[PDB]
C-alpha cells in the first residue's frame, strides 16, 4: 500500500543517516569501500562474500532493506569478514579486529537508542505479508 511504503521510505532514511554516521568515522575508514585486489590480492581468496558501507548503501537505495534486521546482517557480515580474514595476533589484524567490533557495537547501540521498537515492529510485519 501507499502507506506501507512511506513506513519503507522512513526506513531507508534512518538506515542511509546511521550509515553515513558510520562512513564518516575514521575508525571505520577500511569498511568504506570494497578491497582493492592490487592492494590486498588474497582478499577475494579468504572472503567469500564481501561486503561494506559503500555496498550497504547501494542496496538502502535498491530498496533491498525492508527492517533494520535485514540491514543488521550486512553491519554483521562487514565485522565477521573483518574477522575472520585478521584472525592473527600481529598487531596490524588487532587494530582492525578492534574497529571491526566497534563498527558493530556502534551501529547496534545506535539502533537500540534512536529506532523506535514499534517502528521496526511494523516493518517486519510488512514484510512478513508479503
Ligand atoms: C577489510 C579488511 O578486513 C581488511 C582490509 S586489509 C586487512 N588486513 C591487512 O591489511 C593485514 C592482514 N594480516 C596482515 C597484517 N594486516 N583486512
Same mark, same amino acid.
Do not use: W
Given at each position: 500500500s501507499?502507506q ?6 522512513e526506513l531507508?532514511?534512518? *538506515?542511509?543517516?546511521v550509515?553515513?554516521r558510520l562512513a564518516?568515522d ?5 569498511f568504506?569501500?570494497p578491497?582493492?585486489? #592490487? =592492494?590486498v590480492?588474497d582478499?577475494?581468496?579468504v ?9 550497504? &548503501?547501494?542496496? +538502502? !537505495? *535498491?530498496?533491498? @532493506?525492508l527492517?533494520?534486521?535485514d540491514?543488521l546482517? !550486512? +553491519?554483521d557480515? +562487514?565485522?565477521?569478514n573483518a574477522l575472520? @580474514?585478521?584472525?592473527?595476533? #600481529?598487531?596490524? !589484524? ?7 567490533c566497534? *563498527?558493530? !557495537?556502534?551501529? @547496534?547501540?545506535?539502533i537500540? =537508542? =534512536? ?6 515492529? *511494523?516493518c517486519?510485519? &510488512?514484510?512478513?505479508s508479503?
Amino acid at each position: 500500500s501507499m502507506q506501507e511504503e512511506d513506513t519503507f521510505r522512513e526506513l531507508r532514511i534512518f *538506515l542511509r543517516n546511521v550509515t553515513h554516521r558510520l562512513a564518516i568515522d575514521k575508525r571505520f575508514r577500511v569498511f568504506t569501500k570494497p578491497v582493492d585486489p #592490487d =592492494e590486498v590480492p588474497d582478499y577475494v581468496t579468504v572472503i567469500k562474500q564481501p561486503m561494506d558501507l559503500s555496498s550497504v &548503501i547501494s542496496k +538502502i !537505495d *535498491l530498496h533491498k @532493506y525492508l527492517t533494520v534486521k535485514d540491514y543488521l546482517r !550486512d +553491519i554483521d557480515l +562487514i565485522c565477521s569478514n573483518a574477522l575472520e @580474514y585478521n584472525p592473527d595476533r #600481529d598487531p596490524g !589484524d588487532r587494530l582492525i579486529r578492534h574497529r571491526a567490533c566497534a *563498527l558493530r !557495537d556502534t551501529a @547496534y547501540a545506535i539502533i537500540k =537508542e =534512536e529506532l523506535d521498537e514499534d517502528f521496526e515492529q *511494523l516493518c517486519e510485519e &510488512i514484510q512478513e505479508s508479503r
